[PDB]
Amino acid sequence: EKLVQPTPLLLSLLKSAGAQKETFTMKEVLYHLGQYIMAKQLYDEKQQHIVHCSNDPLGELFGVQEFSVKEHRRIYAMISRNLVS
Ligand SMILES: CC(C)(C)C[C@@H]1N[C@@H](C(=O)Nc2ccc(C(N)=O)cc2)[C@H](c2cccc(Cl)c2F)[C@]12C(=O)Nc1cc(Cl)ccc12
């Protein structure tokens, strides 16, 4: 029931992926980032479950060359870096 507010940088990525508003449930943020990841071809299905983002804006906001989509605690933390409230 908590609505979070992406920073301007993260918000721009979400909107490029099709997001329409300025605040979101965490589930919505994860959904739009999933769409962003697929749009930028950072993830290949049925391989190692790795997001490869070293050359993408996402890599900087998160701070990585890659991460596993199974590392959910880490992903929540990397998203949290990019929230206002
Ligand atoms: C990269 C794809 C697959 C397009 C989306 C990812 N699929 C979700 C996922 O967990 N995929 C997955 C795929 C395959 C297997 C397997 N074969 O064992 C296990 C897990 C993952 C996720 C869901 C819910 C909470 C979190 Cl924190 C999360 F990271 C997932 C998601 O739903 N959104 C999201 C956003 C970021 Cl930044 C990063 C990641 C996502």
Side-chain angles (χ1 to χ4, degrees):
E1 58 173 302
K2 171 63 176 239
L3 300 178
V4 302
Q5 180 184 348
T7 62
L9 287 171
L10 174 60
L11 182 64
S12 67
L13 298 197
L14 301 180
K15 292 204 173 179
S16 74
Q20 291 251 224
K21 45 191 156 180
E22 296 187 21
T23 59
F24 304 90
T25 64
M26 182 58 39
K27 285 180 182 173
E28 285 178 279
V29 176
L30 283 162
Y31 185 84
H32 292 301
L33 280 175
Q35 288 306 314
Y36 177 88
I37 284 164
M38 295 316 295
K40 296 299 179 185
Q41 297 195 83
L42 309 182
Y43 186 83
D44 299 282
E45 297 187 71
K46 299 171 176 294
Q47 306 301 338
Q48 289 73 56
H49 317 301
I50 299 300
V51 175
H52 296 280
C53 50
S54 65
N55 292 129
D56 191 89
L58 183 62
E60 294 179 82
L61 298 184
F62 276 19
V64 299
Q65 298 178 82
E66 68 167 61
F67 60 90
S68 165
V69 300
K70 297 183 182 182
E71 297 179 272
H72 287 195
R73 284 184 167 96
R74 294 191 69 226
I75 291 164
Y76 284 119
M78 295 186 292
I79 291 171
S80 292
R81 290 174 42 164
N82 295 280
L83 301 178
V84 180
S85 52

Coordinates of all heavy atoms in Angstrom, one line a residue:
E1 N 0.8 -1.2 0.0 CA 0.0 0.0 0.0 C 0.9 1.3 0.0 O 0.4 2.4 0.1 CB -0.9 0.0 1.2 CG -0.2 -0.1 2.6 CD -1.1 0.1 3.7 OE1 -1.8 1.2 3.8 OE2 -1.2 -0.8 4.6
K2 N 2.2 1.1 -0.1 CA 3.1 2.2 -0.2 C 3.4 2.6 -1.6 O 3.8 1.8 -2.4 CB 4.4 1.7 0.5 CG 5.6 2.7 0.3 CD 5.3 4.1 1.0 CE 6.4 5.0 0.8 NZ 6.9 5.4 2.2
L3 N 3.2 3.9 -1.9 CA 3.5 4.4 -3.2 C 4.9 5.0 -3.2 O 5.1 5.9 -2.3 CB 2.4 5.3 -3.7 CG 1.1 4.6 -3.8 CD1 0.0 5.6 -4.2 CD2 1.1 3.5 -4.8
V4 N 5.8 4.7 -4.1 CA 7.1 5.2 -4.1 C 7.3 6.2 -5.3 O 6.5 6.1 -6.2 CB 8.2 4.1 -4.2 CG1 8.0 3.2 -3.0 CG2 8.1 3.4 -5.5
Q5 N 8.2 7.1 -5.1 CA 8.5 8.1 -6.1 C 9.9 8.0 -6.7 O 10.8 8.3 -6.1 CB 8.3 9.5 -5.5 CG 8.5 10.7 -6.4 CD 8.5 12.0 -5.7 OE1 8.1 12.1 -4.5 NE2 8.9 13.0 -6.4
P6 N 10.0 7.5 -7.9 CA 11.3 7.4 -8.6 C 11.9 8.8 -8.8 O 11.2 9.8 -9.0 CB 10.9 6.8 -10.0 CG 9.7 6.0 -9.7 CD 8.9 6.8 -8.7
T7 N 13.2 8.9 -8.6 CA 14.0 10.1 -8.9 C 13.8 10.4 -10.4 O 13.3 9.5 -11.2 CB 15.5 9.9 -8.7 OG1 15.9 8.8 -9.6 CG2 15.7 9.5 -7.3
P8 N 14.1 11.6 -10.8 CA 14.0 12.0 -12.3 C 14.7 11.0 -13.2 O 14.2 10.7 -14.3 CB 14.6 13.4 -12.3 CG 14.3 13.9 -11.0 CD 14.5 12.8 -10.0
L9 N 15.9 10.5 -12.9 CA 16.6 9.6 -13.7 C 15.9 8.3 -13.9 O 15.7 7.8 -15.0 CB 18.0 9.4 -13.2 CG 19.0 10.5 -13.4 CD1 20.3 10.3 -12.6 CD2 19.3 10.7 -14.9
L10 N 15.5 7.7 -12.8 CA 14.8 6.4 -12.9 C 13.4 6.6 -13.5 O 13.0 5.8 -14.3 CB 14.6 5.8 -11.5 CG 13.7 4.5 -11.5 CD1 14.3 3.5 -12.3 CD2 13.6 4.0 -10.0
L11 N 12.8 7.7 -13.2 CA 11.5 8.0 -13.8 C 11.6 8.0 -15.3 O 10.7 7.5 -16.0 CB 10.9 9.3 -13.3 CG 9.5 9.6 -13.8 CD1 8.5 8.6 -13.4 CD2 9.1 11.0 -13.4
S12 N 12.6 8.6 -15.9 CA 12.8 8.7 -17.3 C 12.9 7.3 -17.9 O 12.4 7.1 -19.0 CB 14.0 9.5 -17.7 OG 15.2 8.9 -17.3
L13 N 13.6 6.4 -17.3 CA 13.6 5.0 -17.7 C 12.3 4.3 -17.7 O 11.9 3.7 -18.7 CB 14.6 4.2 -16.9 CG 16.1 4.7 -16.9 CD1 17.0 3.5 -16.4 CD2 16.5 5.1 -18.3
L14 N 11.5 4.5 -16.6 CA 10.2 3.9 -16.5 C 9.3 4.4 -17.6 O 8.5 3.7 -18.2 CB 9.6 4.2 -15.2 CG 10.4 3.7 -14.0 CD1 9.7 4.1 -12.7 CD2 10.6 2.2 -14.1
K15 N 9.3 5.7 -17.9 CA 8.4 6.3 -18.9 C 8.8 5.9 -20.3 O 8.0 5.7 -21.1 CB 8.4 7.8 -18.8 CG 7.8 8.3 -17.5 CD 7.2 9.7 -17.6 CE 6.4 10.1 -16.4 NZ 5.9 11.5 -16.4
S16 N 10.1 5.7 -20.5 CA 10.6 5.2 -21.8 C 10.1 3.7 -22.0 O 9.9 3.3 -23.2 CB 12.1 5.2 -21.9 OG 12.7 4.2 -21.2
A17 N 9.8 3.0 -20.9 CA 9.3 1.7 -21.0 C 7.8 1.6 -21.1 O 7.2 0.5 -21.2 CB 9.8 0.9 -19.8
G18 N 7.1 2.8 -21.0 CA 5.7 2.8 -21.1 C 4.9 3.2 -19.8 O 3.7 3.3 -19.9
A19 N 5.6 3.5 -18.8 CA 4.9 4.0 -17.5 C 4.3 5.3 -17.8 O 4.7 6.2 -18.6 CB 5.9 4.1 -16.4
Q20 N 3.2 5.6 -17.1 CA 2.3 6.8 -17.3 C 2.3 7.8 -16.2 O 2.1 9.0 -16.4 CB 0.9 6.4 -17.7 CG 0.8 5.7 -19.0 CD 0.1 6.5 -20.1 OE1 -0.8 6.1 -20.8 NE2 0.5 7.8 -20.1
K21 N 2.6 7.3 -15.0 CA 2.5 8.2 -13.8 C 3.8 8.5 -13.2 O 4.9 8.2 -13.7 CB 1.5 7.6 -12.8 CG 1.7 6.1 -12.5 CD 0.6 5.6 -11.7 CE 0.4 4.1 -11.9 NZ -0.7 3.5 -11.1
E22 N 3.8 9.1 -12.0 CA 5.0 9.6 -11.3 C 5.2 8.9 -10.0 O 6.3 9.0 -9.4 CB 4.9 11.1 -11.1 CG 4.9 11.9 -12.4 CD 5.1 13.4 -12.2 OE1 5.5 13.8 -11.1 OE2 4.7 14.2 -13.1
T23 N 4.2 8.1 -9.5 CA 4.4 7.3 -8.4 C 3.8 5.9 -8.7 O 3.0 5.8 -9.5 CB 3.7 7.9 -7.1 OG1 2.3 8.0 -7.4 CG2 4.3 9.2 -6.8
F24 N 4.3 4.9 -7.9 CA 4.1 3.5 -8.2 C 4.1 2.7 -7.0 O 4.8 3.0 -6.0 CB 5.2 3.0 -9.2 CG 5.3 3.8 -10.5 CD1 6.2 4.9 -10.5 CD2 4.6 3.5 -11.6 CE1 6.3 5.7 -11.7 CE2 4.7 4.2 -12.7 CZ 5.5 5.3 -12.8
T25 N 3.5 1.5 -7.0 CA 3.8 0.5 -6.0 C 5.1 -0.1 -6.4 O 5.5 0.0 -7.6 CB 2.7 -0.6 -6.0 OG1 2.8 -1.3 -7.3 CG2 1.4 -0.1 -5.7
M26 N 5.8 -0.7 -5.5 CA 7.1 -1.4 -5.8 C 6.9 -2.4 -6.9 O 7.7 -2.6 -7.8 CB 7.7 -2.0 -4.6 CG 9.0 -2.7 -4.8 SD 10.3 -1.5 -5.5 CE 9.9 -0.1 -4.5
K27 N 5.7 -3.1 -6.9 CA 5.4 -4.1 -7.9 C 5.4 -3.4 -9.3 O 5.9 -4.0 -10.3 CB 4.1 -4.8 -7.7 CG 4.2 -5.8 -6.5 CD 2.8 -6.5 -6.3 CE 2.9 -7.5 -5.1 NZ 1.6 -8.0 -4.8
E28 N 4.8 -2.2 -9.4 CA 4.7 -1.5 -10.7 C 6.1 -1.1 -11.1 O 6.4 -1.2 -12.3 CB 3.8 -0.3 -10.5 CG 2.4 -0.5 -10.5 CD 1.7 0.9 -10.3 OE1 1.6 1.4 -9.2 OE2 1.2 1.4 -11.3
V29 N 6.9 -0.7 -10.2 CA 8.3 -0.3 -10.6 C 9.0 -1.5 -11.2 O 9.7 -1.4 -12.2 CB 9.1 0.3 -9.4 CG1 10.5 0.6 -9.8 CG2 8.4 1.6 -8.9
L30 N 8.9 -2.6 -10.5 CA 9.5 -3.8 -11.0 C 9.0 -4.2 -12.4 O 9.7 -4.7 -13.2 CB 9.3 -5.0 -10.0 CG 10.2 -4.9 -8.8 CD1 9.7 -5.8 -7.7 CD2 11.6 -5.3 -9.2
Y31 N 7.7 -4.0 -12.6 CA 7.1 -4.4 -13.9 C 7.6 -3.5 -15.0 O 8.0 -4.0 -16.0 CB 5.6 -4.2 -13.8 CG 4.9 -4.7 -15.1 CD1 4.6 -6.0 -15.3 CD2 4.6 -3.8 -16.1 CE1 4.0 -6.5 -16.4 CE2 4.0 -4.2 -17.3 CZ 3.7 -5.6 -17.4 OH 3.1 -6.0 -18.6
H32 N 7.6 -2.2 -14.8 CA 8.1 -1.3 -15.8 C 9.6 -1.4 -16.1 O 10.1 -1.3 -17.2 CB 7.8 0.2 -15.4 CG 6.3 0.5 -15.5 ND1 5.6 0.3 -16.6 CD2 5.5 0.9 -14.5 CE1 4.3 0.6 -16.3 NE2 4.2 1.0 -15.1
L33 N 10.4 -1.7 -15.0 CA 11.8 -2.0 -15.2 C 12.0 -3.3 -16.0 O 13.0 -3.4 -16.8 CB 12.5 -2.0 -13.9 CG 12.9 -0.6 -13.3 CD1 13.5 -0.7 -11.9 CD2 13.8 0.1 -14.3
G34 N 11.2 -4.3 -15.8 CA 11.2 -5.5 -16.6 C 11.0 -5.2 -18.0 O 11.7 -5.7 -18.9
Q35 N 10.0 -4.3 -18.3 CA 9.8 -3.9 -19.7 C 10.9 -3.1 -20.3 O 11.3 -3.3 -21.4 CB 8.5 -3.1 -19.7 CG 7.2 -3.9 -19.5 CD 7.1 -5.1 -20.4 OE1 7.3 -4.9 -21.6 NE2 6.8 -6.2 -19.9
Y36 N 11.5 -2.3 -19.4 CA 12.7 -1.5 -19.9 C 13.8 -2.5 -20.2 O 14.5 -2.3 -21.3 CB 13.1 -0.6 -18.8 CG 14.4 0.2 -19.1 CD1 14.3 1.4 -19.8 CD2 15.6 -0.3 -18.8 CE1 15.5 2.1 -20.1 CE2 16.8 0.4 -19.1 CZ 16.7 1.6 -19.8 OH 17.9 2.2 -20.2
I37 N 14.1 -3.4 -19.4 CA 15.2 -4.4 -19.6 C 15.0 -5.1 -20.9 O 15.9 -5.3 -21.7 CB 15.2 -5.4 -18.4 CG1 15.9 -4.7 -17.2 CG2 16.0 -6.7 -18.8 CD1 15.7 -5.4 -15.9
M38 N 13.7 -5.5 -21.2 CA 13.5 -6.3 -22.4 C 13.6 -5.3 -23.6 O 14.1 -5.7 -24.7 CB 12.1 -6.9 -22.4 CG 12.0 -8.0 -21.3 SD 13.4 -9.2 -21.3 CE 13.4 -10.0 -22.9
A39 N 13.1 -4.1 -23.5 CA 13.2 -3.1 -24.6 C 14.6 -2.8 -25.0 O 14.9 -2.6 -26.1 CB 12.5 -1.8 -24.2
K40 N 15.5 -2.8 -24.0 CA 16.9 -2.5 -24.2 C 17.7 -3.7 -24.5 O 19.0 -3.7 -24.7 CB 17.5 -1.7 -23.0 CG 16.9 -0.3 -22.8 CD 17.1 0.6 -24.0 CE 16.4 1.9 -23.8 NZ 16.5 2.8 -25.0
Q41 N 17.1 -4.9 -24.5 CA 17.7 -6.2 -24.8 C 18.9 -6.4 -23.8 O 20.0 -6.9 -24.2 CB 18.3 -6.2 -26.2 CG 17.2 -6.1 -27.3 CD 17.6 -6.5 -28.7 OE1 17.7 -7.7 -29.0 NE2 18.0 -5.5 -29.5
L42 N 18.6 -6.2 -22.5 CA 19.6 -6.4 -21.5 C 19.5 -7.8 -20.9 O 20.3 -8.2 -20.1 CB 19.5 -5.4 -20.4 CG 19.4 -3.9 -20.8 CD1 19.3 -3.1 -19.6 CD2 20.6 -3.6 -21.6
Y43 N 18.5 -8.6 -21.3 CA 18.2 -9.9 -20.8 C 17.9 -10.9 -21.9 O 17.1 -10.6 -22.8 CB 17.0 -9.8 -19.8 CG 16.8 -11.1 -19.1 CD1 17.5 -11.4 -17.9 CD2 15.7 -12.0 -19.5 CE1 17.2 -12.6 -17.2 CE2 15.4 -13.1 -18.7 CZ 16.2 -13.4 -17.6 OH 15.9 -14.5 -16.8
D44 N 18.5 -12.0 -21.8 CA 18.2 -13.1 -22.8 C 17.5 -14.2 -22.1 O 18.0 -14.7 -21.1 CB 19.5 -13.6 -23.4 CG 20.2 -12.5 -24.2 OD1 19.8 -12.2 -25.3 OD2 21.2 -11.9 -23.7
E45 N 16.3 -14.6 -22.5 CA 15.6 -15.7 -21.9 C 16.2 -17.0 -22.0 O 16.8 -17.4 -23.0 CB 14.1 -15.7 -22.4 CG 13.4 -14.4 -22.2 CD 11.9 -14.5 -22.5 OE1 11.1 -15.2 -21.8 OE2 11.5 -13.8 -23.5
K46 N 16.0 -17.9 -21.0 CA 16.5 -19.2 -21.0 C 18.0 -19.4 -21.1 O 18.5 -20.3 -21.8 CB 15.8 -20.0 -22.1 CG 14.2 -20.0 -22.0 CD 13.6 -20.6 -23.2 CE 12.1 -20.7 -23.0 NZ 11.7 -21.7 -22.0
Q47 N 18.7 -18.4 -20.5 CA 20.2 -18.6 -20.5 C 20.6 -18.6 -19.0 O 20.3 -19.5 -18.3 CB 20.8 -17.4 -21.2 CG 20.4 -17.2 -22.7 CD 20.6 -18.5 -23.5 OE1 21.5 -19.3 -23.2 NE2 19.9 -18.6 -24.6
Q48 N 21.4 -17.6 -18.6 CA 21.9 -17.5 -17.2 C 21.1 -16.7 -16.2 O 21.5 -16.5 -15.1 CB 23.4 -17.0 -17.2 CG 24.4 -18.0 -17.8 CD 24.2 -18.1 -19.4 OE1 24.3 -17.1 -20.1 NE2 24.1 -19.3 -19.8
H49 N 20.0 -16.1 -16.7 CA 19.1 -15.3 -15.9 C 19.9 -14.0 -15.5 O 19.6 -13.4 -14.4 CB 18.6 -16.0 -14.7 CG 18.2 -17.4 -15.0 ND1 17.2 -17.7 -15.9 CD2 18.7 -18.6 -14.5 CE1 17.1 -19.1 -16.0 NE2 18.0 -19.6 -15.1
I50 N 20.8 -13.5 -16.3 CA 21.6 -12.3 -16.0 C 21.1 -11.1 -16.8 O 20.9 -11.2 -18.0 CB 23.1 -12.6 -16.3 CG1 23.6 -13.7 -15.5 CG2 23.9 -11.3 -16.1 CD1 23.5 -13.5 -14.0
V51 N 21.0 -10.0 -16.1 CA 20.8 -8.7 -16.8 C 22.2 -8.1 -17.1 O 22.9 -7.8 -16.1 CB 19.9 -7.7 -16.0 CG1 19.9 -6.4 -16.7 CG2 18.5 -8.3 -15.8
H52 N 22.5 -7.8 -18.3 CA 23.7 -7.2 -18.7 C 23.5 -5.8 -19.1 O 22.9 -5.4 -20.1 CB 24.3 -8.0 -20.0 CG 24.6 -9.4 -19.7 ND1 25.8 -9.8 -19.1 CD2 23.9 -10.5 -20.0 CE1 25.8 -11.1 -19.0 NE2 24.7 -11.6 -19.5
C53 N 24.0 -4.9 -18.2 CA 23.6 -3.5 -18.2 C 24.8 -2.5 -18.1 O 24.7 -1.4 -17.8 CB 22.7 -3.2 -17.1 SG 23.2 -3.7 -15.5
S54 N 26.0 -3.0 -18.5 CA 27.3 -2.3 -18.3 C 27.3 -1.0 -19.2 O 27.9 0.0 -18.9 CB 28.5 -3.1 -18.6 OG 28.5 -3.6 -19.9
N55 N 26.6 -1.1 -20.3 CA 26.7 0.0 -21.3 C 25.3 0.7 -21.3 O 25.1 1.5 -22.3 CB 27.0 -0.5 -22.7 CG 28.4 -1.0 -22.8 OD1 28.7 -2.2 -23.2 ND2 29.4 -0.2 -22.4
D56 N 24.5 0.5 -20.4 CA 23.1 1.0 -20.4 C 23.0 2.0 -19.2 O 23.6 1.8 -18.2 CB 22.1 -0.1 -20.2 CG 20.7 0.4 -20.5 OD1 20.3 0.4 -21.7 OD2 20.0 0.9 -19.5
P57 N 22.1 3.0 -19.4 CA 21.8 3.9 -18.2 C 21.5 3.2 -16.9 O 21.8 3.6 -15.9 CB 20.6 4.8 -18.8 CG 20.9 4.8 -20.2 CD 21.4 3.5 -20.6
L58 N 20.8 2.0 -17.1 CA 20.4 1.2 -15.9 C 21.6 0.8 -15.1 O 21.5 0.8 -13.8 CB 19.6 0.0 -16.3 CG 19.1 -0.8 -15.1 CD1 18.1 0.0 -14.3 CD2 18.4 -2.1 -15.7
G59 N 22.7 0.5 -15.7 CA 23.9 0.0 -15.0 C 24.4 1.1 -14.1 O 25.0 0.7 -13.0
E60 N 24.3 2.4 -14.4 CA 24.8 3.4 -13.6 C 23.9 3.7 -12.4 O 24.4 3.9 -11.3 CB 25.0 4.7 -14.4 CG 26.0 4.6 -15.5 CD 26.1 5.9 -16.3 OE1 26.8 6.9 -15.8 OE2 25.5 6.0 -17.4
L61 N 22.6 3.8 -12.6 CA 21.6 4.0 -11.6 C 21.7 2.9 -10.5 O 21.5 3.1 -9.3 CB 20.2 4.1 -12.1 CG 20.0 5.2 -13.1 CD1 18.5 5.2 -13.6 CD2 20.4 6.5 -12.5
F62 N 22.0 1.7 -11.0 CA 22.2 0.5 -10.2 C 23.6 0.3 -9.7 O 23.8 -0.1 -8.6 CB 21.7 -0.8 -10.9 CG 20.2 -1.0 -10.9 CD1 19.3 0.0 -10.6 CD2 19.7 -2.3 -11.2 CE1 18.0 -0.3 -10.5 CE2 18.4 -2.5 -11.1 CZ 17.5 -1.5 -10.8
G63 N 24.6 0.6 -10.6 CA 26.0 0.5 -10.2 C 26.7 -0.8 -10.6 O 27.6 -1.2 -9.9
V64 N 26.2 -1.4 -11.6 CA 26.7 -2.8 -12.0 C 26.9 -3.0 -13.5 O 26.4 -2.3 -14.3 CB 25.8 -3.9 -11.5 CG1 25.7 -3.8 -10.0 CG2 24.4 -3.7 -12.1
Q65 N 27.8 -4.0 -13.8 CA 27.9 -4.5 -15.2 C 26.8 -5.5 -15.5 O 26.3 -5.6 -16.6 CB 29.2 -5.2 -15.4 CG 30.5 -4.3 -15.1 CD 31.8 -5.1 -15.3 OE1 32.2 -5.3 -16.4 NE2 32.3 -5.6 -14.2
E66 N 26.4 -6.2 -14.4 CA 25.4 -7.2 -14.5 C 24.8 -7.5 -13.2 O 25.4 -7.2 -12.1 CB 25.9 -8.5 -15.2 CG 27.0 -9.2 -14.3 CD 27.3 -10.6 -14.8 OE1 27.8 -10.7 -16.0 OE2 27.0 -11.6 -14.1
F67 N 23.7 -8.2 -13.1 CA 23.1 -8.8 -11.9 C 22.2 -9.9 -12.3 O 21.7 -10.0 -13.4 CB 22.4 -7.8 -11.1 CG 21.2 -7.2 -11.7 CD1 20.0 -7.7 -11.6 CD2 21.4 -6.0 -12.5 CE1 18.9 -7.1 -12.2 CE2 20.3 -5.4 -13.1 CZ 19.0 -6.0 -13.0
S68 N 22.0 -10.9 -11.4 CA 21.1 -12.0 -11.6 C 19.7 -11.5 -11.2 O 19.5 -10.9 -10.2 CB 21.5 -13.2 -10.8 OG 20.4 -14.1 -10.8
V69 N 18.7 -11.9 -12.0 CA 17.3 -11.5 -11.7 C 16.8 -12.4 -10.6 O 15.6 -12.2 -10.1 CB 16.3 -11.7 -12.9 CG1 16.8 -10.8 -14.1 CG2 16.3 -13.2 -13.4
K70 N 17.6 -13.3 -10.1 CA 17.2 -14.1 -8.9 C 17.6 -13.4 -7.6 O 17.2 -13.7 -6.5 CB 17.9 -15.5 -8.9 CG 17.4 -16.4 -10.0 CD 18.1 -17.7 -9.9 CE 17.7 -18.6 -11.1 NZ 18.3 -20.0 -10.9
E71 N 18.5 -12.3 -7.7 CA 19.0 -11.6 -6.5 C 18.0 -10.5 -6.1 O 18.3 -9.3 -6.2 CB 20.3 -11.0 -6.9 CG 21.4 -12.0 -7.2 CD 22.8 -11.3 -7.5 OE1 23.0 -10.9 -8.7 OE2 23.6 -11.1 -6.6
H72 N 16.9 -10.9 -5.6 CA 15.8 -10.0 -5.3 C 16.1 -8.9 -4.3 O 15.8 -7.8 -4.4 CB 14.5 -10.7 -5.0 CG 13.9 -11.3 -6.2 ND1 12.6 -11.8 -6.3 CD2 14.4 -11.6 -7.4 CE1 12.3 -12.3 -7.4 NE2 13.4 -12.2 -8.2
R73 N 16.8 -9.3 -3.2 CA 17.1 -8.3 -2.2 C 18.0 -7.3 -2.8 O 17.8 -6.1 -2.5 CB 17.9 -9.0 -1.0 CG 17.1 -9.8 0.0 CD 17.9 -10.3 1.1 NE 17.1 -10.8 2.2 CZ 16.8 -12.1 2.4 NH1 17.2 -13.0 1.5 NH2 16.1 -12.5 3.4
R74 N 19.0 -7.7 -3.6 CA 19.9 -6.7 -4.2 C 19.2 -5.8 -5.1 O 19.4 -4.6 -5.2 CB 21.0 -7.5 -5.0 CG 21.9 -8.3 -4.1 CD 23.2 -8.8 -4.9 NE 24.0 -7.7 -5.2 CZ 24.6 -7.5 -6.5 NH1 24.3 -8.4 -7.4 NH2 25.4 -6.5 -6.7
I75 N 18.2 -6.4 -5.9 CA 17.5 -5.5 -6.8 C 16.6 -4.5 -6.1 O 16.5 -3.3 -6.5 CB 16.6 -6.4 -7.8 CG1 17.5 -7.2 -8.7 CG2 15.6 -5.6 -8.6 CD1 16.9 -8.4 -9.4
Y76 N 15.9 -4.9 -5.0 CA 15.2 -3.9 -4.2 C 16.1 -2.8 -3.7 O 15.7 -1.7 -3.7 CB 14.5 -4.6 -3.1 CG 13.2 -5.4 -3.5 CD1 13.1 -6.7 -3.2 CD2 12.2 -4.7 -4.0 CE1 12.0 -7.4 -3.6 CE2 11.0 -5.4 -4.4 CZ 10.9 -6.7 -4.2 OH 9.8 -7.4 -4.5
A77 N 17.3 -3.2 -3.3 CA 18.2 -2.2 -2.8 C 18.7 -1.2 -3.9 O 18.8 0.0 -3.7 CB 19.5 -2.9 -2.2
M78 N 19.0 -1.8 -5.1 CA 19.4 -0.9 -6.2 C 18.3 0.0 -6.7 O 18.5 1.1 -7.0 CB 19.9 -1.8 -7.3 CG 21.1 -2.6 -7.0 SD 21.9 -3.5 -8.3 CE 20.6 -4.8 -8.6
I79 N 17.0 -0.5 -6.6 CA 15.9 0.4 -6.9 C 15.8 1.5 -5.9 O 15.5 2.6 -6.2 CB 14.6 -0.4 -7.0 CG1 14.6 -1.3 -8.3 CG2 13.4 0.5 -7.1 CD1 13.5 -2.3 -8.4
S80 N 15.9 1.1 -4.6 CA 15.8 2.0 -3.5 C 16.7 3.2 -3.6 O 16.4 4.3 -3.2 CB 15.9 1.3 -2.2 OG 14.8 0.4 -2.0
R81 N 17.9 3.0 -4.1 CA 18.9 4.0 -4.3 C 18.3 5.2 -5.2 O 18.7 6.3 -5.1 CB 20.1 3.5 -5.1 CG 21.0 2.6 -4.4 CD 22.1 2.0 -5.3 NE 22.6 3.0 -6.2 CZ 23.8 2.9 -6.9 NH1 24.5 1.8 -6.7 NH2 24.2 3.9 -7.6
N82 N 17.3 4.8 -6.0 CA 16.7 5.7 -7.0 C 15.3 6.1 -6.7 O 14.5 6.3 -7.6 CB 16.8 5.0 -8.3 CG 18.2 4.8 -8.8 OD1 18.9 5.7 -9.3 ND2 18.7 3.6 -8.6
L83 N 14.9 6.1 -5.4 CA 13.6 6.6 -5.0 C 13.8 7.8 -4.1 O 14.8 8.0 -3.5 CB 12.9 5.5 -4.1 CG 12.6 4.2 -4.9 CD1 12.0 3.2 -3.9 CD2 11.8 4.4 -6.1
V84 N 12.8 8.7 -4.2 CA 12.8 10.0 -3.4 C 12.2 9.6 -2.1 O 12.8 9.7 -1.0 CB 12.0 11.1 -4.1 CG1 12.0 12.3 -3.3 CG2 12.6 11.3 -5.5
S85 N 10.9 9.3 -2.1 CA 10.2 8.8 -1.0 C 9.4 7.5 -1.4 O 9.6 7.1 -2.6 CB 9.2 9.8 -0.5 OG 8.4 10.3 -1.6
Ligands
LIG1 C1 14.3 -9.4 -16.3 C2 12.8 -9.8 -16.4 C3 12.8 -11.4 -16.4 C4 12.2 -9.3 -17.7 C5 12.0 -9.3 -15.2 C6 12.5 -10.0 -13.9 N1 11.7 -11.3 -13.6 C7 11.6 -11.5 -12.1 C8 12.3 -12.7 -11.8 O1 12.5 -13.1 -10.6 N2 12.7 -13.5 -12.9 C9 13.2 -14.9 -12.9 C10 13.4 -15.5 -14.1 C11 13.8 -16.8 -14.2 C12 14.1 -17.5 -13.0 C13 14.5 -18.9 -13.0 N3 14.5 -19.5 -14.3 O2 14.9 -19.5 -12.0 C14 14.0 -16.8 -11.7 C15 13.5 -15.5 -11.7 C16 12.3 -10.3 -11.5 C17 11.7 -9.8 -10.2 C18 10.4 -10.0 -9.9 C19 9.9 -9.6 -8.6 C20 10.7 -9.0 -7.7 C21 12.1 -8.8 -8.1 CL1 13.2 -8.0 -7.0 C22 12.5 -9.2 -9.3 F1 13.8 -9.0 -9.6 C23 12.3 -9.2 -12.7 C24 10.9 -8.5 -12.7 O3 9.8 -9.0 -12.8 N4 11.1 -7.1 -12.8 C25 12.5 -6.9 -12.6 C26 13.1 -5.6 -12.6 C27 14.5 -5.6 -12.4 CL2 15.3 -4.1 -12.3 C28 15.2 -6.8 -12.3 C29 14.6 -8.0 -12.4 C30 13.2 -8.0 -12.5

